[PDB]
Design a protein around this ligand. Structure first.
Ligand SMILES: [Cu+]
Ligand SMILES: [K+]
Ligand SMILES: [K+]
Ligand SMILES: [K+]
Ligand SMILES: [K+]
Ligand SMILES: [K+]
Ligand SMILES: [K+]
Ligand SMILES: [K+]
Ligand SMILES: [K+]
Ligand SMILES: [K+]
Ligand SMILES: [K+]
Ligand SMILES: [K+]
Ligand SMILES: [K+]
Ligand SMILES: [K+]
Ligand SMILES: [K+]
Ligand SMILES: [K+]
Ligand SMILES: [K+]
Ligand SMILES: [K+]
Ligand SMILES: [K+]
Ligand SMILES: [K+]
Ligand SMILES: [K+]
Ligand SMILES: [K+]
Ligand SMILES: [K+]
Ligand SMILES: [K+]
Ligand SMILES: [K+]
Ligand SMILES: [K+]
Ligand SMILES: [K+]
Ligand SMILES: [K+]
Ligand SMILES: [K+]
Ligand SMILES: [K+]
Ligand SMILES: [K+]
Ligand SMILES: [K+]
Ligand SMILES: [K+]
Ligand SMILES: [K+]
Ligand SMILES: [K+]
Ligand SMILES: [K+]
Ligand SMILES: [K+]
Ligand SMILES: [K+]
Ligand SMILES: [K+]
Ligand SMILES: [K+]
Ligand SMILES: [K+]
Ligand SMILES: [K+]
Ligand SMILES: [Mg+2]
Ligand SMILES: [Mg+2]
Ligand SMILES: [Mg+2]
Ligand SMILES: [Mg+2]
Ligand SMILES: [Mg+2]
Ligand SMILES: [Mg+2]
Ligand SMILES: [Mg+2]
Ligand SMILES: [Mg+2]
Ligand SMILES: [Mg+2]
Ligand SMILES: [Mg+2]
Ligand SMILES: [Mg+2]
Ligand SMILES: [Mg+2]
Ligand SMILES: [Mg+2]
Ligand SMILES: [Mg+2]
Ligand SMILES: [Mg+2]
Ligand SMILES: [Mg+2]
Ligand SMILES: [Mg+2]
Ligand SMILES: [Mg+2]
Ligand SMILES: [Mg+2]
Ligand SMILES: [Mg+2]
Ligand SMILES: [Mg+2]
Ligand SMILES: [Mg+2]
Ligand SMILES: [Mg+2]
Ligand SMILES: [Mg+2]
Ligand SMILES: [Mg+2]
Ligand SMILES: [Mg+2]
Ligand SMILES: [Mg+2]
Ligand SMILES: [Mg+2]
Ligand SMILES: [Mg+2]
Ligand SMILES: [Mg+2]
Ligand SMILES: [Mg+2]
Ligand SMILES: [Mg+2]
Ligand SMILES: [Mg+2]
Ligand SMILES: [Mg+2]
Ligand SMILES: [Mg+2]
Ligand SMILES: [Mg+2]
Ligand SMILES: [Mg+2]
Ligand SMILES: [Mg+2]
Ligand SMILES: [Mg+2]
Ligand SMILES: [Mg+2]
Ligand SMILES: [Mg+2]
Ligand SMILES: [Mg+2]
Ligand SMILES: [Mg+2]
Ligand SMILES: [Mg+2]
Ligand SMILES: [Mg+2]
Ligand SMILES: [Mg+2]
Ligand SMILES: [Mg+2]
Ligand SMILES: [Mg+2]
Ligand SMILES: [Mg+2]
Ligand SMILES: [Mg+2]
Ligand SMILES: [Mg+2]
Ligand SMILES: [Mg+2]
Ligand SMILES: [Mg+2]
Ligand SMILES: [Mg+2]
Lengths: 129, 123
RNA sequence: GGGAGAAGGCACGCUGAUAUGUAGGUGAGGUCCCUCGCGGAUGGAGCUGAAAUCAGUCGAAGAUACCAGCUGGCUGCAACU
RNA sequence: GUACACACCGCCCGUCACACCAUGGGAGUGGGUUGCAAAAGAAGUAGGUAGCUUAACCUUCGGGAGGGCGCUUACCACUUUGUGAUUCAUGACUGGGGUGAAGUCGUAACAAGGUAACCGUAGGGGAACCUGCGGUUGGAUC
RNA sequence: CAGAAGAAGCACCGGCUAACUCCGUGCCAGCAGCCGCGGUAAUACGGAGGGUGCAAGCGUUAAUCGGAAUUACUGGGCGUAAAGCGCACGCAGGCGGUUUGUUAAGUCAGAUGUGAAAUCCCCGGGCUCAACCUGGGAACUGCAUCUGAUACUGGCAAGCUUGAGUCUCGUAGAGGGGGGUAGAAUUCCAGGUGUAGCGGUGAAAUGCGUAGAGAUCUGGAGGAAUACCGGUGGCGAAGGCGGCCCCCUGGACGAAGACUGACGCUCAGGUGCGAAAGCGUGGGGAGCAAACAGGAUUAGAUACCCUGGUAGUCCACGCCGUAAACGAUGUCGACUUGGAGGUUGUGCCCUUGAGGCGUGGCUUCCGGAGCUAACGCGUUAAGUCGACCGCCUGGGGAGUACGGCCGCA
RNA sequence: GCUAGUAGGUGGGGUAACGGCUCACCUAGGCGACGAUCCCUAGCUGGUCUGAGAGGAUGACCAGCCACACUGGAACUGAGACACGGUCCAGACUCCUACGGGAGGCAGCAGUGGGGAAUAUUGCACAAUGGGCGCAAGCCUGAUGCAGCCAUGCCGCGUGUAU
């Protein structure tokens, strides 16, 4: 059964980019929306929107630069079978700082650089490069 | 294997057995030759290789090679053996140390003398 | 199911206390009820009475006499009574 | 199609015979350790106390209290007995295995390998194997 | 003070691996970590000359980690290389859709105490240098307590409907269990006609036949299996299920709704089902046929071929628990270009039929990206991900021995 | 699968102290697939070797902790011991004996025999640091400071320089 909606979201992004889809659509959640906000702020996706009231649906508009997907790789790190938490001094660097790690901290979901600036550790949701 | 499976049963390292068990992790062992004889190698080699059946101070009875041209070993000779297999000889896992105890060096040896227990010539 | 009482071993008499006789058994008078009898309930006097534990004590020996399995190992034959 | 490549005058299977090696069973038998059920009871400590003997205290000067020795009981080391367990060594004989070497018997497999091969099972046969029943294609030809 | 005066060896030189020639020997003597070298022109054996590497040491042996991502947490695999339990149900365990509140256990931040000294590391100091000694720091990645943070995970409370399930109507189906029945055919029995062969093979022979076979007609007995339909058709968890009829009964799918409200996924151990052969007791026995017998073939022929033929195949109940039980591919869920078919539902439209436009379930072949050692897989993945389980770790010994459990064997 | 002082409770006793530590009675409990019980191996740590790391291996020297002192058992004294160079009993060995009976314990330093492939001198001094006793002086100290032997390791230097 479905047991990791976040990995499902990441996989939808990965497969849509591989299939050259303009947009990808999925059932929504607040955590998915926070992750989408980080992706949009970092410029990996173009936009996102939530439609509906009782069964909210999140749509992500993917982007391509020169005929190539902007999201070169997106990978779940913490997972239900194995949670991963890092302290502030051990936050991972993705692609020598060229990529991002999405981190859930007590101040919300942000990138690894933002968590380092705030001086917080947290749960390593995924790597994006 | 999943992490749950590894939590239940961890990865197991394979134990490696020594190729020289009669030494019992000693660099050498002393023995008494019970037999001194020759034997023929496995194919594709042909020769009369010199070996000795020797009983060690720990009670192990093994076969040891006698390297070098010519030797002075006979029954009841007291010798020192070290590790080292002879590839073409079946079940010969040890080498006799030339120049130790009753085993003499090799006569008229000029090169690699220390491997055959030969003193430096006075030249 | 057996083999098995396998094998092997420990205790055992007497006296006192626990308890002027115990647990248990039996059960009168009295009291209550009754559809009043060879009745029911309660009640326990009297009678009878193991077994155990603790302490002591005599002898060479306490299942003291009579009475009352010897045991184990390998194998042939016939299943068995 | 192929398990062939000094290339089918290829490759290759098993019994049997010979040599060596390790190992299972084996009338059993010898050691090591250990369980259980008992026996045993040095010294020590503790409890009790007939008997013997006492420097300090108390005496009404006789003794008293208290102590010690001895004796006794409890616990327990050595040691002993019976019966198990486990482990090591060893044993006439026996089972298969590996290695070597190639002697004897065949030719099972690889090509449609000359009866397609193989799996489970069952029966049979000096040996590779053969036969029945179901199954697979990891079968050539069609 | 005196005088270069007292002071250099060890391993290696075909490749890995830095360093090459001559002579001796001739599968001998010998070398060897591996690949291998030695057979009369050996850079591989032994000596010599030359050279290479280390140097008061140099080699060898033993032993640990490394290289070994070759137990893979970091950091591996399972279609065919070793590896998916034969198939399921399911306890424990692991995992858990979506919203709000609360808690602060996990998690995160800070502080405090502790984490002995020495050792390791950094900056310095002293022995002429160095080894060595030494000052200060850093580190000791941990534990405990206190104070905070609340995104994520957990607990608690309340919900929601999209996962999961219930009801209503219908559909297809060799799904299962029980009983009955039909026709074809084989064998056997009896009778009629009829006469010299039949049967079998590559050719034969065994066998059957003048005691009348084989052939043909009629009647009867009995067992087993269901031609055609029939189909890379259907159903079933797998194993498997095929004439027709009745009875009992399981699952799947579709259309509109209504209802419950995460009730879910996976599953060590456990339990159940599980082809054929085989086993036990009682029946049955036509056809077939292990074993067995005879005839052939052959060098032989314990076979292949022929003539016979017993267990068994069949039924009831019980056991066994294995198969190339295979898609050699575990279960569940999500996502990702296409084409042509099969089968089974259902909606709409028209000129009403081998009609057109859709929308579900299951299924066959091809092929794109991607993946793969390749072969190939390819929306029914071997692609891209998550949850849980099973399994592999060179070949042989060996799925064997011994021990346990199970079994009548 | 294991456990009958076994698990817990009450009361008495006992210890410097809590406690089945021990005894009497009552309850029938306690441990275990988060591996009890049994079997094999083993002193533990700071650290050491290796490794890029994660890990793997290891625990000699130095320091902390534990245990042992010929073997088995026991207590006495004492602040502290169930006591390496104390006591008692038993045992095996060695030794003395007048045959009745007695003596001993290098796993302290050095050394001997033995085993082994293999590991050193029966040295000097309490001058320094530290310890015991003593008011002190001082005495004692194989701790310690040094010396001897060994290329065992690490580090430095020389075995000549120029022509
Ligand atoms: Cu005397
Ligand atoms: K050769
Ligand atoms: K008595
Ligand atoms: K009475
Ligand atoms: K009575
Ligand atoms: K009797
Ligand atoms: K019989
Ligand atoms: K080929
Ligand atoms: K042969
Ligand atoms: K044998
Ligand atoms: K006394
Ligand atoms: K024994
Ligand atoms: K034996
Ligand atoms: K064959
Ligand atoms: K074949
Ligand atoms: K078969
Ligand atoms: K034969
Ligand atoms: K020559
Ligand atoms: K892994
Ligand atoms: K907390
Ligand atoms: K929370
Ligand atoms: K039905
Ligand atoms: K029928
Ligand atoms: K479960
Ligand atoms: K039958
Ligand atoms: K039949
Ligand atoms: K037949
Ligand atoms: K039936
Ligand atoms: K079976
Ligand atoms: K198949
Ligand atoms: K369809
Ligand atoms: K349709
Ligand atoms: K069974
Ligand atoms: K049977
Ligand atoms: K106790
Ligand atoms: K108590
Ligand atoms: K008590
Ligand atoms: K390390
Ligand atoms: K360690
Ligand atoms: K001891
Ligand atoms: K001491
Ligand atoms: K001093
Ligand atoms: Mg008997
Ligand atoms: Mg009476
Ligand atoms: Mg009589
Ligand atoms: Mg006889
Ligand atoms: Mg009889
Ligand atoms: Mg041939
Ligand atoms: Mg044996
Ligand atoms: Mg006793
Ligand atoms: Mg006594
Ligand atoms: Mg075969
Ligand atoms: Mg053949
Ligand atoms: Mg043939
Ligand atoms: Mg064949
Ligand atoms: Mg088998
Ligand atoms: Mg046959
Ligand atoms: Mg080179
Ligand atoms: Mg030459
Ligand atoms: Mg050479
Ligand atoms: Mg590794
Ligand atoms: Mg691999
Ligand atoms: Mg294969
Ligand atoms: Mg395979
Ligand atoms: Mg399967
Ligand atoms: Mg299931
Ligand atoms: Mg959740
Ligand atoms: Mg420190
Ligand atoms: Mg500091
Ligand atoms: Mg929550
Ligand atoms: Mg019949
Ligand atoms: Mg139905
Ligand atoms: Mg299971
Ligand atoms: Mg059958
Ligand atoms: Mg049979
Ligand atoms: Mg039968
Ligand atoms: Mg018949
Ligand atoms: Mg036949
Ligand atoms: Mg199997
Ligand atoms: Mg099948
Ligand atoms: Mg399989
Ligand atoms: Mg189906
Ligand atoms: Mg394809
Ligand atoms: Mg693959
Ligand atoms: Mg077996
Ligand atoms: Mg306690
Ligand atoms: Mg030890
Ligand atoms: Mg590594
Ligand atoms: Mg130590
Ligand atoms: Mg000693
Ligand atoms: Mg005292
Ligand atoms: Mg002590
Ligand atoms: Mg002392
Ligand atoms: Mg001493
Ligand atoms: Mg000494
Ligand atoms: Mg010696």
């Amino acid at each position: 059964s479905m047991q990791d909606p976040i990995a499902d979201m990441l996989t939808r992004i990965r497969n849509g980019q591989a299939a050259n889809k303009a947009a990808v659509t999925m059932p929504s959640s607040k955590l998915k929306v926070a992750i989408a906000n980080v992706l949009k702020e970092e410029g990996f996706i173009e936009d996102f929107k939530v439609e509906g009231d009782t069964k909210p649906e999140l749509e992500l508009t993917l982007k391509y630069f020169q005929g190539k997907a902007v999201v070169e790789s997106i990978q779940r790190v913490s997972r239900p079978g194995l949670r991963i938490y890092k302290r502030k001094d051990e936050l991972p660097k993705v692609m020598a700082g060229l990529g991002i790690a999405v981190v859930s901290t007590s101040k919300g979901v942000m990138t690894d650089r933002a968590a380092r600036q705030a001086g917080l550790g947290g749960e390593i949701i995924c790597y994006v490069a | 294997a999943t992490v749950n499976q590894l939590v239940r049963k961890p990865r197991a390292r394979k134990v490696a057995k020594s190729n020289v068990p009669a030494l019992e992790a000693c660099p050498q062992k002393r023995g008494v030759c019970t037999r001194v004889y020759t034997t023929t190698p496995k194919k594709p080699n042909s020769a009369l290789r010199k070996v000795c059946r020797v009983r060690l101070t720990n009670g192990f009875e093994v076969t040891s090679y006698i390297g070098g041209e010519g030797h002075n070993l006979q029954e009841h000779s007291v010798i020192l053996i070290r590790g080292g297999r002879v590839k073409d000889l079946p079940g010969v896992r040890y080498h006799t140390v030339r120049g130790a105890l009753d085993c003499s060096g090799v006569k008229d040896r000029k090169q690699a003398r220390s491997k055959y227990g030969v003193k430096r010539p006075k030249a």
